[PDB]
Amino acid sequence: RLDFGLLGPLQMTIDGTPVPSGTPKQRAVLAMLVINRNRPVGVDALITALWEEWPPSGARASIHSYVSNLRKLLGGAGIDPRVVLAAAPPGYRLSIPDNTCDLGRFVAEKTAGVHAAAAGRFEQASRHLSAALREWRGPVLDDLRDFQFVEPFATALVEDKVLAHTAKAEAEIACGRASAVIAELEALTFEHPYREPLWTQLITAYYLSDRQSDALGAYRRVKTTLADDLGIDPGPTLRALNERILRQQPLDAKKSAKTTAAGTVTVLDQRTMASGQQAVAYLHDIASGRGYPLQAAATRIGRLHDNDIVLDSANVSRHHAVIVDTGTNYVINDLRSSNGVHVQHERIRSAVTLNDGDHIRICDHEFTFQISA
């Protein structure tokens, strides 16, 4: 009877009917609880998410009132609000099945699409990916964009949205429908001009639709865009693709789609321990050997003691970085820090998806990111 939406303005629906979830601060409590579904969120964490550096004197009283209000709303679905939104010494926990959250459905459908493509079942990969993408209503938590915590979470989920758009195109191209994905890829390369995998699929689609000129033209366009805007060359995948197209060599779109999926299966596998219980990701401090579990959806890193991982050095920014677990990927975000964030020994420009074993540097602190620990 209860359903929650993060992929657009925050939504709480009872029996399919939206229920207004309160004032912005109360809505932010609900958002944090849905983001951290089935895990406790501490009262201190809630206070930080709501008021950042400046909570009012009665911040805890307000939290108590928001939980009370939310429970009254939840009780409209005929459930026990004290079980569904449970109070723990470690804070508050919203207990809801994954599939009752739009993000949870997105995760399940994307995973199903990956497994299908890995097995070379491109028709059902495409069907799953379409279902995944239908879960998106608008910008992540659009009604709460003024809250700091939304920014890295939204940015992280867009990484996954792009990957789904890309995998969907791969599947369609593999199914012989290159011509039919072109318009959507054109629109996506405008919304996401710097996403090279999107351009790779568009150029592939042009070329397999007997439009070599448009394919070559699109490569020239992305090359110009990346050069002027970012100061970078296109990656090896785009470069190799253009070379094939220049020489009018055949492409193997089925094999490409299979290869991509098989690579993703690997990542999906290391997240899952053999006993169904999901694996905990860790940052392992190289110098000290100390392991920092990535327990929550968002792990906050910086100099200030309110961070989840505290780096006590004067050169580290107050709030330096956040690693977000999207349910599919772990993505690190640089929070406009002075020194930046360095992954695999290069400065990240926005946010980057982390791979198991990645070297991460923040100022003088160096870590191995590990997905399986």
Tab-separated table of C-alpha atoms in Angstrom:
chain	number	residue	atom	x	y	z
A	1	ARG	CA	0.000	0.000	0.000
A	2	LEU	CA	2.933	2.359	0.674
A	3	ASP	CA	5.255	3.583	-2.071
A	4	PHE	CA	8.107	6.095	-2.074
A	5	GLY	CA	9.719	8.092	-4.872
A	6	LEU	CA	13.169	9.708	-4.987
A	7	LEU	CA	13.581	9.908	-8.776
A	8	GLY	CA	11.830	13.268	-9.131
A	9	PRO	CA	10.169	15.382	-6.427
A	10	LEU	CA	9.895	13.361	-3.192
A	11	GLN	CA	6.768	11.201	-3.306
A	12	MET	CA	4.863	9.233	-0.710
A	13	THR	CA	1.860	7.407	-2.148
A	14	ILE	CA	-0.796	5.468	-0.284
A	15	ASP	CA	-2.757	3.141	-2.586
A	16	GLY	CA	-1.332	5.031	-5.581
A	17	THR	CA	-2.556	8.391	-4.264
A	18	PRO	CA	0.179	10.951	-3.462
A	19	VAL	CA	0.264	12.161	0.148
A	20	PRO	CA	1.827	15.604	0.824
A	21	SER	CA	4.726	14.852	3.181
A	22	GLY	CA	4.971	18.193	5.035
A	23	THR	CA	7.299	21.197	5.383
A	24	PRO	CA	10.739	21.129	3.653
A	25	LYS	CA	12.554	19.999	6.818
A	26	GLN	CA	10.059	17.168	7.385
A	27	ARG	CA	10.313	16.205	3.708
A	28	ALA	CA	14.111	16.156	4.118
A	29	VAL	CA	13.734	13.726	7.075
A	30	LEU	CA	11.572	11.452	4.894
A	31	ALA	CA	14.054	11.725	1.983
A	32	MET	CA	16.984	10.745	4.274
A	33	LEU	CA	14.973	7.788	5.638
A	34	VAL	CA	14.034	6.539	2.122
A	35	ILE	CA	17.629	7.056	0.880
A	36	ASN	CA	18.750	4.985	3.874
A	37	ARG	CA	15.822	2.530	3.752
A	38	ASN	CA	16.131	-0.463	6.086
A	39	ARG	CA	19.085	1.159	7.884
A	40	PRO	CA	19.088	3.467	10.918
A	41	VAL	CA	19.722	7.164	10.398
A	42	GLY	CA	21.124	8.861	13.490
A	43	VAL	CA	19.503	12.010	14.870
A	44	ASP	CA	22.832	13.850	14.448
A	45	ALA	CA	22.889	12.860	10.753
A	46	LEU	CA	19.325	14.152	10.319
A	47	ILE	CA	20.225	17.442	12.028
A	48	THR	CA	23.213	17.834	9.683
A	49	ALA	CA	21.100	17.019	6.583
A	50	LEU	CA	18.370	19.512	7.596
A	51	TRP	CA	20.293	22.495	8.966
A	52	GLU	CA	23.908	21.783	7.942
A	53	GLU	CA	26.153	24.035	10.072
A	54	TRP	CA	23.379	26.009	11.838
A	55	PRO	CA	20.723	23.964	13.664
A	56	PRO	CA	18.202	25.819	15.863
A	57	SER	CA	18.290	25.224	19.635
A	58	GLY	CA	15.241	22.932	19.463
A	59	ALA	CA	16.515	20.846	16.527
A	60	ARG	CA	15.946	17.527	18.349
A	61	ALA	CA	12.406	18.583	19.360
A	62	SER	CA	11.755	19.324	15.672
A	63	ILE	CA	13.067	15.897	14.613
A	64	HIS	CA	10.692	14.291	17.161
A	65	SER	CA	7.799	16.308	15.697
A	66	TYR	CA	8.695	15.335	12.104
A	67	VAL	CA	8.834	11.603	12.949
A	68	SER	CA	5.496	11.953	14.774
A	69	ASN	CA	3.937	13.724	11.748
A	70	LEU	CA	5.379	11.218	9.273
A	71	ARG	CA	4.072	8.285	11.339
A	72	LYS	CA	0.566	9.796	11.260
A	73	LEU	CA	0.797	9.964	7.461
A	74	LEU	CA	2.199	6.411	7.157
A	75	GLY	CA	-0.607	5.096	9.390
A	76	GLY	CA	-2.966	6.030	6.552
A	77	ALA	CA	-1.741	2.855	4.820
A	78	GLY	CA	-3.112	0.618	7.617
A	79	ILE	CA	0.349	-0.352	8.900
A	80	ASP	CA	1.929	0.084	12.353
A	81	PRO	CA	3.857	3.371	11.964
A	82	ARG	CA	6.095	2.413	14.919
A	83	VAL	CA	7.238	-0.701	13.038
A	84	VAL	CA	7.513	0.932	9.591
A	85	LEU	CA	9.247	4.046	10.991
A	86	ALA	CA	11.003	2.603	14.029
A	87	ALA	CA	12.854	4.498	16.730
A	88	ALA	CA	16.235	3.061	17.673
A	89	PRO	CA	18.913	4.334	20.048
A	90	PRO	CA	20.977	4.548	16.768
A	91	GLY	CA	18.252	6.869	15.353
A	92	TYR	CA	15.314	6.126	13.047
A	93	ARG	CA	14.824	3.355	10.486
A	94	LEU	CA	12.271	3.237	7.682
A	95	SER	CA	11.600	-0.454	6.987
A	96	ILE	CA	10.251	-0.926	3.475
A	97	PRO	CA	10.808	-3.545	0.746
A	98	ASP	CA	13.226	-2.358	-1.965
A	99	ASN	CA	10.578	-2.653	-4.703
A	100	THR	CA	8.302	-0.149	-2.931
A	101	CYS	CA	10.871	2.553	-3.730
A	102	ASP	CA	11.257	3.890	-7.303
A	103	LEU	CA	15.054	3.775	-6.929
A	104	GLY	CA	14.799	0.133	-5.779
A	105	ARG	CA	12.784	-0.703	-8.904
A	106	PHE	CA	15.348	1.115	-11.074
A	107	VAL	CA	18.181	-0.932	-9.488
A	108	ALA	CA	16.325	-4.265	-9.941
A	109	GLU	CA	15.398	-3.596	-13.579
A	110	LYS	CA	18.877	-2.351	-14.546
A	111	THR	CA	20.475	-5.448	-12.956
A	112	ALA	CA	18.001	-7.686	-14.840
A	113	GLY	CA	18.904	-5.849	-18.070
A	114	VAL	CA	22.624	-6.409	-17.446
A	115	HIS	CA	22.257	-10.175	-16.866
A	116	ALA	CA	20.111	-10.505	-19.991
A	117	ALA	CA	22.636	-8.646	-22.181
A	118	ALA	CA	25.513	-10.721	-20.750
A	119	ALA	CA	23.689	-13.856	-21.898
A	120	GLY	CA	23.123	-12.256	-25.324
A	121	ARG	CA	19.390	-11.864	-24.707
A	122	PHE	CA	19.212	-8.328	-26.084
A	123	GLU	CA	15.427	-8.153	-26.536
A	124	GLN	CA	14.772	-8.739	-22.834
A	125	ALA	CA	17.763	-6.568	-21.811
A	126	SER	CA	16.077	-3.693	-23.686
A	127	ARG	CA	12.712	-4.450	-22.068
A	128	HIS	CA	14.216	-4.349	-18.564
A	129	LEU	CA	16.129	-1.142	-19.314
A	130	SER	CA	12.933	0.547	-20.562
A	131	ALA	CA	11.211	-0.459	-17.293
A	132	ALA	CA	14.162	0.928	-15.301
A	133	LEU	CA	14.040	4.291	-17.111
A	134	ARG	CA	10.246	4.645	-16.658
A	135	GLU	CA	10.921	4.938	-12.891
A	136	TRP	CA	12.352	8.431	-13.502
A	137	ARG	CA	9.858	11.287	-13.090
A	138	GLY	CA	12.225	14.269	-12.952
A	139	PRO	CA	15.349	15.660	-11.234
A	140	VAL	CA	16.228	13.662	-8.097
A	141	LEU	CA	14.473	15.209	-5.074
A	142	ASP	CA	13.690	18.339	-7.098
A	143	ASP	CA	11.536	19.819	-4.308
A	144	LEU	CA	14.548	19.661	-1.957
A	145	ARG	CA	17.305	20.992	-4.239
A	146	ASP	CA	18.179	23.688	-1.680
A	147	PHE	CA	19.452	20.999	0.744
A	148	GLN	CA	23.169	20.217	0.431
A	149	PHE	CA	22.763	16.414	0.838
A	150	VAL	CA	20.629	16.177	-2.325
A	151	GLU	CA	23.427	17.439	-4.633
A	152	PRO	CA	25.933	14.535	-4.422
A	153	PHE	CA	23.077	11.982	-4.249
A	154	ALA	CA	21.379	13.362	-7.388
A	155	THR	CA	24.740	13.619	-9.209
A	156	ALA	CA	25.482	9.984	-8.333
A	157	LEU	CA	22.064	8.703	-9.539
A	158	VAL	CA	22.494	10.551	-12.852
A	159	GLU	CA	25.693	8.493	-13.419
A	160	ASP	CA	23.416	5.416	-13.241
A	161	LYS	CA	20.693	7.007	-15.390
A	162	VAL	CA	23.287	7.676	-18.117
A	163	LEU	CA	24.577	4.077	-17.876
A	164	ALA	CA	20.971	2.834	-18.297
A	165	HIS	CA	20.345	5.134	-21.295
A	166	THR	CA	23.625	3.861	-22.798
A	167	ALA	CA	22.916	0.154	-22.159
A	168	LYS	CA	19.404	0.613	-23.568
A	169	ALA	CA	20.897	2.013	-26.803
A	170	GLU	CA	23.409	-0.865	-26.986
A	171	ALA	CA	20.574	-3.359	-26.647
A	172	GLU	CA	18.454	-1.669	-29.358
A	173	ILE	CA	21.418	-1.401	-31.747
A	174	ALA	CA	22.213	-5.089	-31.075
A	175	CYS	CA	18.567	-5.895	-31.908
A	176	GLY	CA	18.936	-4.196	-35.301
A	177	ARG	CA	17.179	-0.923	-34.426
A	178	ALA	CA	20.039	1.612	-34.705
A	179	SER	CA	17.831	4.000	-36.726
A	180	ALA	CA	15.202	4.080	-33.950
A	181	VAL	CA	17.527	5.224	-31.113
A	182	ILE	CA	19.097	8.183	-32.962
A	183	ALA	CA	16.586	10.889	-31.939
A	184	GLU	CA	16.800	9.995	-28.233
A	185	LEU	CA	20.619	9.836	-28.374
A	186	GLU	CA	20.670	13.268	-30.054
A	187	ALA	CA	18.574	14.677	-27.177
A	188	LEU	CA	20.718	12.915	-24.560
A	189	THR	CA	24.027	14.199	-26.018
A	190	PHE	CA	22.657	17.741	-25.558
A	191	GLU	CA	21.603	17.149	-21.951
A	192	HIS	CA	24.810	15.231	-21.259
A	193	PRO	CA	27.380	16.690	-23.689
A	194	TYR	CA	30.480	15.230	-21.988
A	195	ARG	CA	29.350	11.598	-21.659
A	196	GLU	CA	31.537	9.804	-24.164
A	197	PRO	CA	29.648	6.462	-23.953
A	198	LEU	CA	26.479	8.275	-25.114
A	199	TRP	CA	28.322	9.739	-28.114
A	200	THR	CA	29.804	6.289	-28.835
A	201	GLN	CA	26.275	4.875	-29.188
A	202	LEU	CA	25.031	7.819	-31.295
A	203	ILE	CA	27.985	7.555	-33.705
A	204	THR	CA	27.467	3.770	-33.874
A	205	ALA	CA	23.754	4.326	-34.578
A	206	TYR	CA	24.458	6.833	-37.383
A	207	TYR	CA	26.980	4.484	-38.973
A	208	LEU	CA	24.729	1.405	-38.824
A	209	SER	CA	21.882	3.456	-40.316
A	210	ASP	CA	23.997	4.009	-43.476
A	211	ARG	CA	24.778	7.567	-42.316
A	212	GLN	CA	28.590	7.587	-42.262
A	213	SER	CA	28.747	11.357	-42.834
A	214	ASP	CA	26.595	12.047	-39.762
A	215	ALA	CA	28.742	9.605	-37.739
A	216	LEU	CA	31.989	11.349	-38.737
A	217	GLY	CA	30.315	14.731	-38.162
A	218	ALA	CA	29.238	13.698	-34.659
A	219	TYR	CA	32.773	12.592	-33.754
A	220	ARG	CA	34.104	15.975	-34.919
A	221	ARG	CA	31.425	17.651	-32.769
A	222	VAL	CA	32.260	15.736	-29.562
A	223	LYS	CA	36.007	16.200	-30.168
A	224	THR	CA	35.500	19.987	-30.428
A	225	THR	CA	33.246	20.001	-27.338
A	226	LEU	CA	35.693	18.009	-25.159
A	227	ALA	CA	38.651	20.105	-26.375
A	228	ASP	CA	37.072	23.552	-25.837
A	229	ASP	CA	35.017	22.765	-22.729
A	230	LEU	CA	37.226	20.309	-20.833
A	231	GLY	CA	40.693	20.524	-22.412
A	232	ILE	CA	40.700	16.770	-23.117
A	233	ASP	CA	40.907	14.475	-26.161
A	234	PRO	CA	38.260	11.805	-26.797
A	235	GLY	CA	38.986	8.494	-25.040
A	236	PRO	CA	40.347	5.358	-26.785
A	237	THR	CA	36.837	3.958	-27.373
A	238	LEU	CA	35.680	7.011	-29.348
A	239	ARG	CA	39.019	7.262	-31.155
A	240	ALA	CA	38.965	3.586	-32.216
A	241	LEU	CA	35.324	3.880	-33.354
A	242	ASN	CA	36.043	6.887	-35.578
A	243	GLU	CA	38.969	5.031	-37.216
A	244	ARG	CA	36.744	2.051	-38.085
A	245	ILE	CA	34.106	4.387	-39.544
A	246	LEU	CA	36.687	6.324	-41.630
A	247	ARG	CA	37.856	3.032	-43.189
A	248	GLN	CA	34.254	1.728	-43.324
A	249	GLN	CA	35.099	-1.421	-41.357
A	250	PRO	CA	32.268	-3.548	-39.896
A	251	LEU	CA	31.135	-3.141	-36.285
A	252	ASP	CA	29.980	-6.000	-34.038
A	253	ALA	CA	27.186	-4.376	-32.012
A	254	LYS	CA	26.024	-7.669	-30.476
A	255	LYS	CA	29.546	-8.439	-29.220
A	256	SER	CA	29.967	-4.861	-27.925
A	257	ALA	CA	26.669	-5.055	-26.021
A	258	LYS	CA	27.640	-8.458	-24.577
A	259	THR	CA	31.119	-7.251	-23.561
A	260	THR	CA	29.731	-4.182	-21.742
A	261	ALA	CA	27.183	-6.280	-19.819
A	262	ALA	CA	29.760	-8.954	-18.839
A	263	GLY	CA	31.955	-6.189	-17.392
A	264	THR	CA	28.982	-4.926	-15.346
A	265	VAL	CA	28.145	-8.463	-14.144
A	266	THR	CA	31.644	-8.525	-12.592
A	267	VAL	CA	30.855	-5.358	-10.588
A	268	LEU	CA	27.408	-6.687	-9.571
A	269	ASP	CA	29.033	-9.942	-8.387
A	270	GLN	CA	31.593	-8.381	-6.011
A	271	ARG	CA	28.776	-6.405	-4.334
A	272	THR	CA	27.047	-9.696	-3.492
A	273	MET	CA	28.576	-12.115	-0.991
A	274	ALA	CA	27.779	-15.831	-1.501
A	275	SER	CA	25.278	-15.859	1.393
A	276	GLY	CA	22.853	-13.302	-0.103
A	277	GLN	CA	24.047	-10.745	2.456
A	278	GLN	CA	25.426	-7.736	0.562
A	279	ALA	CA	29.117	-6.806	0.786
A	280	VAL	CA	30.292	-3.762	2.731
A	281	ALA	CA	32.524	-1.321	0.860
A	282	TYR	CA	35.556	0.161	2.636
A	283	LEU	CA	38.140	2.893	2.325
A	284	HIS	CA	41.449	1.452	3.478
A	285	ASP	CA	43.950	4.084	4.619
A	286	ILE	CA	47.227	3.041	2.982
A	287	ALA	CA	49.488	4.736	5.562
A	288	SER	CA	47.697	3.554	8.726
A	289	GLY	CA	45.904	0.376	7.603
A	290	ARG	CA	42.663	1.715	9.110
A	291	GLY	CA	39.464	0.627	7.362
A	292	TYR	CA	36.477	2.950	7.074
A	293	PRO	CA	33.242	1.102	6.231
A	294	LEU	CA	30.930	2.861	3.773
A	295	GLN	CA	27.888	2.131	5.922
A	296	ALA	CA	25.318	4.669	4.694
A	297	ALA	CA	24.074	5.716	1.261
A	298	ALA	CA	26.284	8.814	1.559
A	299	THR	CA	29.686	8.745	3.269
A	300	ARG	CA	30.899	12.273	4.023
A	301	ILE	CA	34.652	13.003	4.058
A	302	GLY	CA	36.416	16.126	5.320
A	303	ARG	CA	38.261	17.976	8.075
A	304	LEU	CA	35.270	18.853	10.291
A	305	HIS	CA	34.316	16.366	13.019
A	306	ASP	CA	30.724	16.104	11.694
A	307	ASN	CA	32.027	14.093	8.704
A	308	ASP	CA	31.700	10.293	8.610
A	309	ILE	CA	35.387	10.034	7.770
A	310	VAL	CA	37.406	12.756	9.492
A	311	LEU	CA	40.717	13.794	7.907
A	312	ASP	CA	42.418	15.975	10.545
A	313	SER	CA	44.745	17.932	8.215
A	314	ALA	CA	44.576	21.713	7.713
A	315	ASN	CA	44.785	21.320	3.897
A	316	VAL	CA	41.669	19.095	3.747
A	317	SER	CA	38.446	21.076	3.149
A	318	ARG	CA	35.776	21.307	5.887
A	319	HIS	CA	33.522	19.111	3.754
A	320	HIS	CA	35.763	17.725	1.057
A	321	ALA	CA	34.090	14.739	-0.633
A	322	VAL	CA	31.140	12.342	-0.447
A	323	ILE	CA	30.985	8.747	-1.648
A	324	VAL	CA	27.428	7.755	-2.590
A	325	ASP	CA	26.212	4.172	-2.876
A	326	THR	CA	23.483	4.302	-5.528
A	327	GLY	CA	22.520	0.632	-5.151
A	328	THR	CA	24.404	0.012	-8.409
A	329	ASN	CA	27.636	1.972	-8.067
A	330	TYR	CA	29.778	3.837	-5.585
A	331	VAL	CA	30.462	7.339	-6.865
A	332	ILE	CA	32.828	9.834	-5.298
A	333	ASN	CA	31.981	13.542	-5.471
A	334	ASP	CA	34.350	16.473	-5.029
A	335	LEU	CA	32.531	19.178	-3.021
A	336	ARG	CA	34.346	22.125	-4.649
A	337	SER	CA	37.381	21.434	-2.454
A	338	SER	CA	40.566	23.508	-2.567
A	339	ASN	CA	42.901	20.613	-3.472
A	340	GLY	CA	40.405	18.439	-5.370
A	341	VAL	CA	39.918	14.653	-5.277
A	342	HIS	CA	42.302	12.301	-7.082
A	343	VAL	CA	41.226	8.863	-8.290
A	344	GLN	CA	43.693	6.522	-9.989
A	345	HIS	CA	46.246	9.361	-9.749
A	346	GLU	CA	44.292	12.062	-11.597
A	347	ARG	CA	42.121	14.973	-10.468
A	348	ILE	CA	38.414	14.300	-10.934
A	349	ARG	CA	36.417	17.092	-12.530
A	350	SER	CA	32.935	16.349	-11.190
A	351	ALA	CA	32.250	12.904	-9.844
A	352	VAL	CA	33.544	9.517	-10.849
A	353	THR	CA	32.272	5.969	-10.483
A	354	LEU	CA	34.662	3.972	-8.294
A	355	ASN	CA	36.080	0.594	-9.305
A	356	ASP	CA	37.159	-2.075	-6.814
A	357	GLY	CA	40.799	-1.390	-5.891
A	358	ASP	CA	40.854	2.275	-6.994
A	359	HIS	CA	43.488	4.520	-5.456
A	360	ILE	CA	41.883	7.597	-3.882
A	361	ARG	CA	43.854	10.622	-2.689
A	362	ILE	CA	42.567	13.551	-0.669
A	363	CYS	CA	45.455	15.927	-0.030
A	364	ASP	CA	48.063	13.824	1.823
A	365	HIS	CA	45.628	11.014	2.722
A	366	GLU	CA	45.630	7.970	0.430
A	367	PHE	CA	43.184	5.070	0.365
A	368	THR	CA	42.336	1.913	-1.503
A	369	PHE	CA	38.619	1.713	-2.217
A	370	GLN	CA	37.476	-1.899	-1.788
A	371	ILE	CA	34.010	-3.216	-2.753
A	372	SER	CA	34.384	-6.724	-1.280
A	373	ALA	CA	35.701	-6.094	2.266
